[PDB]
Design an enzyme around this catalytic site. Structure first.
Site, PDB file in Angstrom:
ATOM      1  N   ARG B  78      41.941  35.716  56.673  1.00 19.53           N
ATOM      2  CA  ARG B  78      41.605  34.844  55.818  1.00 19.53           C
ATOM      3  C   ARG B  78      42.316  33.366  55.913  1.00 19.53           C
ATOM      4  O   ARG B  78      43.627  33.658  55.723  1.00 19.53           O
ATOM      5  CB  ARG B  78      41.408  35.550  54.658  1.00 19.53           C
ATOM      6  CG  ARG B  78      41.043  34.519  53.604  1.00 19.53           C
ATOM      7  CD  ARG B  78      39.604  33.928  53.706  1.00 19.53           C
ATOM      8  NE  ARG B  78      39.154  33.414  52.379  1.00 19.53           N
ATOM      9  CZ  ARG B  78      38.546  34.622  51.385  1.00 19.53           C
ATOM     10  NH1 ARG B  78      39.134  35.786  51.641  1.00 19.53           N
ATOM     11  NH2 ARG B  78      38.374  34.281  50.315  1.00 19.53           N
ATOM     12  N   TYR B  89      47.247  24.473  51.569  1.00 15.18           N
ATOM     13  CA  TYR B  89      47.515  24.502  50.182  1.00 15.18           C
ATOM     14  C   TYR B  89      48.392  23.361  49.799  1.00 15.18           C
ATOM     15  O   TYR B  89      49.668  23.134  50.689  1.00 15.18           O
ATOM     16  CB  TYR B  89      48.531  25.839  49.696  1.00 15.18           C
ATOM     17  CG  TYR B  89      47.657  27.045  49.844  1.00 15.18           C
ATOM     18  CD1 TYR B  89      46.980  27.813  50.761  1.00 15.18           C
ATOM     19  CD2 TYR B  89      47.194  27.630  48.598  1.00 15.18           C
ATOM     20  CE1 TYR B  89      46.315  28.713  50.579  1.00 15.18           C
ATOM     21  CE2 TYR B  89      46.648  28.651  48.328  1.00 15.18           C
ATOM     22  CZ  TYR B  89      46.055  29.374  49.629  1.00 15.18           C
ATOM     23  OH  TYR B  89      44.872  30.367  49.428  1.00 15.18           O
ATOM     24  N   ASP B 115      42.168  38.777  36.020  1.00 20.03           N
ATOM     25  CA  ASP B 115      41.619  38.869  37.628  1.00 20.03           C
ATOM     26  C   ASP B 115      42.194  39.836  38.484  1.00 20.03           C
ATOM     27  O   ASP B 115      42.126  39.997  39.540  1.00 20.03           O
ATOM     28  CB  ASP B 115      41.748  37.584  38.255  1.00 20.03           C
ATOM     29  CG  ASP B 115      43.235  37.126  38.295  1.00 20.03           C
ATOM     30  OD1 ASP B 115      44.424  37.816  38.481  1.00 20.03           O
ATOM     31  OD2 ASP B 115      43.395  35.737  37.919  1.00 20.03           O
ATOM     32  N   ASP B 120      49.246  34.170  38.747  1.00 25.02           N
ATOM     33  CA  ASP B 120      49.483  32.938  39.983  1.00 25.02           C
ATOM     34  C   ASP B 120      50.482  31.848  39.493  1.00 25.02           C
ATOM     35  O   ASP B 120      50.311  31.073  38.307  1.00 25.02           O
ATOM     36  CB  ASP B 120      48.439  32.300  40.418  1.00 25.02           C
ATOM     37  CG  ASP B 120      47.615  33.282  40.987  1.00 25.02           C
ATOM     38  OD1 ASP B 120      47.856  34.268  41.686  1.00 25.02           O
ATOM     39  OD2 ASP B 120      46.261  33.194  41.036  1.00 25.02           O
ATOM     40  N   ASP B 152      41.501  32.826  35.676  1.00 23.31           N
ATOM     41  CA  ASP B 152      42.384  32.609  36.859  1.00 23.31           C
ATOM     42  C   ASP B 152      43.398  31.532  36.413  1.00 23.31           C
ATOM     43  O   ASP B 152      43.308  30.373  36.809  1.00 23.31           O
ATOM     44  CB  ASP B 152      41.804  32.253  38.174  1.00 23.31           C
ATOM     45  CG  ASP B 152      42.484  32.530  39.375  1.00 23.31           C
ATOM     46  OD1 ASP B 152      43.770  32.869  39.340  1.00 23.31           O
ATOM     47  OD2 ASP B 152      41.816  32.140  40.422  1.00 23.31           O
TER      48      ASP B 152
END
Ligand SMILES: [Mn+2]
Ligand SMILES: [Mn+2]
Ligand SMILES: [Mn+2]
Ligand SMILES: [Mn+2]
EC number: 3.6.1.1
Lengths: 279, 283
Positions: B78, B89, B115, B120, B152
């Site tokens: 991926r 990113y 999640d 994150d 998220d």
């Protein structure tokens, strides 16, 4: 068939890339035909800097067979800084061989002199190119950046083999398929030198990207200047070539004097180049 | 000192990175203290994805010592696609160890469940980090991305060693030193999955990035969920491997685990498919 002969490790002073035609080094500046297809206006482009890279690599007018090497500023290697939201160069950057912007010539509309180098080309296709690659591209338009009193034309082109190449025919089409790309390009050239202490650059035509027809005129003119130069009665430019017999400087012997491919692993680049500048 | 133990070649299915504490592998998820400096709220961040990269690397919950490995979809590696004007990113991306977003719990202000992963973190400093690096960062704010009915959260942080770190103390300072970075971050999270066929993501609080105080509250909560998780007290642990080598009071503690991980097998990066080069213009 065009290939590349690397000598030295990338990101160092010994790094040189020579273009080869069927195994033999030729001049990147003089020996590659400007036209891949003259009747269809398909040009050959020599790529110097791949998209998203920082090393300021360029064809050297000073050396024999004019190999691509990294620009330096008083012994220090040159890198362009990252300017938010961009990462290095935003296009596969290069030049059209057999073109030269005569610094003695002043363009009426731009009122600035040539920059003394092959005309610059921005290739906007999806694939990232490699240094020393010879791509066949179609011209779509052209912008005029004014830098230090010189007209710094930037041709907008696309690899003819890109899956979208058939859809793009003139500058207007670029905004159809790559919305915002032209504004970003304009932004990029206006600010890329600011991190180096330099001021912002100006654009002729109010930043307007002229169309293909206009682009083709400027290209033919620079090709003519180059013809004037390479021919008998024309500086520091090395005019040695191995494919044009009618020129005073022709020399097949030149090819053989080139040292063999000495491919080494890329040298590391300083961590300071990572920095993103917010201008 | 923390090091990394690479096994396999980057950009391959065999690729794995373990974090080591003084030479022995520890769990990236459970064994690294959330706080570097509890008093001043300096956290330890595990970096998974370096800025300007495409490989979707992440700490794997279903494996012992939870190494960082590349996400896969349909047996294939991926990668996030390039969305104009961004390249991969736009931040050094990672997570806070010892945190977990409990999926059997809905947050009050966002009304969605967690999640099921460590919280994150978006590290905005100038240096590009490396996968498996443990940086000490200060939290500045937090955004709430709503994805597939789950909250998220994305914490905005900065390496304590960044030249501008002391200038940054709360969410308002980011816009003063990195103008436009927050709008781009919003833009990026709203559209990054579109090239994959997915629709755009929604943002809680109208995309507002909450300040430091708010961020610390959410971080504390996820740390607590993790404490209930690692202590064997979760109603549903989700198949998560809880093996650890630094927490004796836990049912799953095991010094032996460290020694079972194979030696560093560094190989040269495998090439990435050319299709990943493509820039998508999502407007
Ligand atoms: Mn040039
Ligand atoms: Mn130029
Ligand atoms: Mn994550
Ligand atoms: Mn999350």
């Amino acid at each position: 068939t065009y290939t590349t002969r690397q000598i030295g490790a990338k990101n160092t002073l010994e790094y040189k890339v020579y273009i080869e035609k069927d195994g033999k080094p030729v001049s990147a500046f003089h020996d590659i035909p400007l036209y891949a297809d003259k009747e269809n206006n398909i040009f050959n482009m020599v790529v110097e800097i791949p998209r998203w890279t920082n090393a300021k690599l360029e064809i050297t007018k000073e050396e024999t067979l004019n190999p691509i090497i990294q620009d330096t500023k008083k012994g220090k290697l040159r890198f362009v800084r990252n300017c938010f939201p961009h990462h290095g160069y935003i296009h596969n950057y290069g030049a059209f061989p057999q073109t030269w912007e005569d610094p003695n010539v002043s363009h009426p509309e731009t009122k600035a002199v040539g920059d003394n180098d092959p005309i610059d080309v921005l290739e906007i296709g999806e694939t990232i190119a490699y240094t020393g690659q010879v791509k066949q591209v179609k011209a779509l338009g052209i912008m005029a950046l004014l830098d230090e009193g010189e007209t710094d034309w930037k041709v907008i082109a696309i690899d003819i083999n890109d899956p979208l190449a058939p859809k793009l025919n003139d500058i207007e089409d670029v905004e159809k398929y790559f919305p915002g790309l032209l504004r970003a390009t304009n932004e990029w050239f206006r600010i890329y030198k600011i991190p180096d202490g330099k001021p912002e650059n100006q654009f002729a035509f109010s930043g307007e990207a002229k169309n293909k027809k206009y682009a083709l005129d400027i290209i033919k003119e620079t090709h003519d200047s180059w013809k004037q130069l390479i021919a008998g009665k024309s500086k520091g430019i090395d005019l040695t070539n191995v494919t044009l017999p009618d020129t005073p400087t022709y020399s097949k012997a030149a090819s053989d004097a080139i040292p063999p491919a000495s491919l080494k692993a890329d040298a590391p680049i300083d961590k300071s180049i990572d920095k993103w500048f917010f201008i």
